[PDB]
Write a sequence for this structure.
């Protein structure tokens, strides 16, 4: 639950030369980004996850 | 205080001998083969809520040689308008006629005005 | 064979259609040794803060575009902790690694020359005149050649065919160079040692070398290929010393 | 490196732009050994009549097409002597080799995800309801996701982004998967062992796994590139046993 | 300063099959020619070059 | 693997999309040895003046173009010092290296057969008639097949499907051949020894073999691909002897 003490930074992406296509190919392409943890990652101090929640039993 | 960036006159040039700070003047020129339609210089003056440039950027518009002088007893291979700088005009003679002289004339610019080269050829009977 | 990676400082460059790497005269950048040195005091050698890949803004290769030139240093003078040591110090020394990056498709065609010129002393437009400093270098904004002979006071005679130095623009192949032929490669790398006639030299006064990018064969494409083809230049110092510290210069 | 051939039974698959072969969890299909077995009688092992490449009908990748899913087995239940032993026998075991084949030109672009999901228990459209069996599997005809939330009784909630299981459709990369990026490869191969919590299990009751093909980046092309791009799926059992023979089931 | 005694020849270039391009690429291409001397070249009898010339001092 | 260079005499051939080199029957050209020879006198062996690459004029592969054939020798009879020794000498012997060169883009398609036929005795158009010599060979100008059955006296029956010899045009694969498939290669090379039933044989009387170039799959292209696709043929003698000198023939 990061604050601005333990902030981590920000990543940004820019064209270096641009996209060049011949005639007869589309001009609008797409990128995609896959996140994973390196081989020195670790987590600690178990807590509950805020993403699941109910309002009565039988759920 | 600094005026915004002058810019870039294509087919031309901007000369800033003293920076772009307040009260600094800049000059405009056009390359060989273009005429300068616009202002010649621009100063860094006070503009309302900033300092900006006295005059906007001018344009270097192509200098054109006039239509090539036709020749009797002859012909031009695909004659055209818009005969800019360094462009050529090729002649030929007709049946039964002999060609004399520079058989093709190339457009240059002198004193900032378009001018063809030497006279077109002649067709002898 | 065409893949390559260049890791300098905290910066990396990946490439997949590289031709080779010109090392200027077979010579790699190195530090000033003890017997070729002339200054007495101990030099600064920051080594990771300054010897990394600084990327200058990119230029648009149009169908009718003569060329471009940058002057190093005075291009990297506002780049991080190279452009700061370079301010606080009198004497500086460094080599570079220039990576020029221009990519197109397989339906485009063209050919750039990428050439580093040592001491590219240039010639004003009025033969009886003197250049400015602005007319030699705009910083990271490239100056542009011209397809015809230029006019105007104090501005370099930048018709391409003479390259502003009074020589033939096709003989520039004597300098360390590469080409970018949009049918084979899409990047040129030149590793440039410290070429100069004094061991260390000031960095604001002397434009140690000039990078010229000159399209010999121009762009072209057909029905709806991509109209916009940019060129990006990355420079990375190497073996950078400074000597003679005092208060910061100002211009 | 990109060429490959897979010979199973009397069937062969040739490919020339293969990326690699995912072996599900580093594990290859194998027979039930003597100490992990629970059924007493001798199993049938036909070995060449059933462990070959069965090709299911092909689907047309359109510009706006959410995805497709098949359920194995119950897709190969009408395929030769796999779908017959599978009828006459109570218990069955087998791994598979899934080869997905989609080819385009160099002027097309796209990206499929090809992912095998064990026990892909799915969620009906009316939250307080129950799926059919038809709504989970049509045999060899693929079921189709939907670009919006679906309605209607007994039909799986097949909006693509949740993949019908209630999870995020981008996290499916935890399952054995590949991509088909029409700029690099044109086929994905996944070798899938027998993953289940009992040694052998009935073949009509339990959909042992689910094959989902989901285009993340859609098709595109220009002036007159080929409009029709099909996808073909081939499955081939491996190390297939059956046990518990009796008269043939019926549905 | 070659004459027709020490003439050297002439080079000439012709299409062998021609240029073939798909749809959507330009039809007009360009060649370029780079001249260099082999590893057995040599020159002798120094002379002045005719390419530089002046008409007074201070030039 | 696809690059190749062939250096014969003062001539070189470079290629970058070659498939392989057919050596006719596993056999390379060689000189007449002492125990298989029949003529008494000493042969001429010029060796560099005659065993080089002679290039014949090129033909335009059109969309509807049946084929072409040349006859060797009598094609190289006006080529340099092969076609001169060939005049002054009664008996001649030589093998050849045929390099056919046809290049197209990646948006074109087609398939030529390039086939050398020994003793390609041909059949007139009127079944009860006799060919000319002009109707067998025009020198370096190729003769052309026809997409229909030809008429006219003394002119070979040159419908393509029979290839002018009365056989099936698809069985010509029994002869030394290659294909030019405009998607893979752009040149075919056949190295052809001296195949004949006498050690040496006259060069004006006997057309030792015939080179047929027959497009099976025709040209095609789309919106504005290059309309003009030429084919160029280069032949280079090898191990060329002559014997029996006297005054020069005339025709």
């Amino acid at each position: 639950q990061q604050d601005e003490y333990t902030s981590a930074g920000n990543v940004t992406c820019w064209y270096q030369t641009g996209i060049v296509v011949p005639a007869g190919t589309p001009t609008s392409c797409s990128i995609m980004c896959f996140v994973s943890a390196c081989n020195d990652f670790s987590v600690r101090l178990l807590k509950d996850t805020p993403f699941i929640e109910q309002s009565a039993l039988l759920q | 205080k600094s005026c915004p960036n002058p810019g870039e006159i294509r087919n031309g040039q901007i000369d800033v001998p003293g920076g772009i700070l307040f009260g600094a003047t800049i000059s405009f020129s056009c390359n060989t083969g273009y005429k300068l339609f616009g202002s010649t210089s621009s100063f860094c003056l006070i503009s309302g809520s900033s300092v900006q440039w006295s005059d906007p950027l001018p344009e270097c518009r192509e200098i054109y040689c006039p239509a090539p002088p036709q020749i009797d007893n002859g012909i031009i291979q695909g004659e055209r308008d818009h005969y800019g700088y360094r462009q050529s005009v090729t002649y030929a003679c007709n049946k039964g006629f002999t060609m004399i002289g520079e058989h093709s004339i190339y457009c240059t610019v002198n004193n900032d005005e378009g001018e063809w080269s030497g006279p077109p050829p002649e067709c002898r009977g | 064979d065409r893949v390559r990676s260049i890791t300098l400082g905290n910066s990396t460059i990946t490439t997949q259609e590289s031709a080779n790497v010109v090392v200027a005269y077979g010579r790699w950048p190195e530090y000033l040794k003890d017997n070729e040195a002339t200054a007495e005091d101990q030099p600064t050698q920051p080594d990771v803060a300054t010897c990394r890949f600084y990327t200058l803004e990119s230029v648009t290769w149009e169908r009718d575009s003569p060329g471009w030139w940058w002057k190093f240093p005075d291009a990297l003078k506002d780049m991080g902790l190279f452009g700061q040591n370079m301010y606080y110090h009198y004497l500086g020394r460094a080599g570079y690694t220039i990576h020029v990056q221009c990519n197109a498709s397989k339906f485009h065609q063209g050919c750039l020359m990428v050439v580093c010129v040592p001491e590219a002393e240039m010639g004003c437009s009025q033969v009886d005149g003197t250049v400015n400093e602005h007319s030699l270098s705009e910083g990271e904004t490239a100056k542009k050649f011209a397809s015809t002979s230029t006019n105007g006071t104090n501005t370099v005679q930048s018709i391409v065919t003479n390259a502003g130095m009074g020589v033939g623009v096709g003989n520039l192949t004597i300098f360390p160079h590469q080409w970018i032929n949009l049918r084979t490669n899409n990047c040129a790398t030149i590793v440039m040692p410290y070429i100069n006639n004094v061991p260390m030299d000031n960095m604001f006064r002397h434009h140690n070398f000039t990078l010229m990018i000159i399209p010999f064969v121009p762009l072209d494409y057909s029905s709806d290929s991509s109209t916009y083809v940019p060129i990006t230049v990355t420079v990375a110092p190497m073996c950078a010393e400074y000597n003679g510290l005092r208060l910061a210069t100002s211009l």
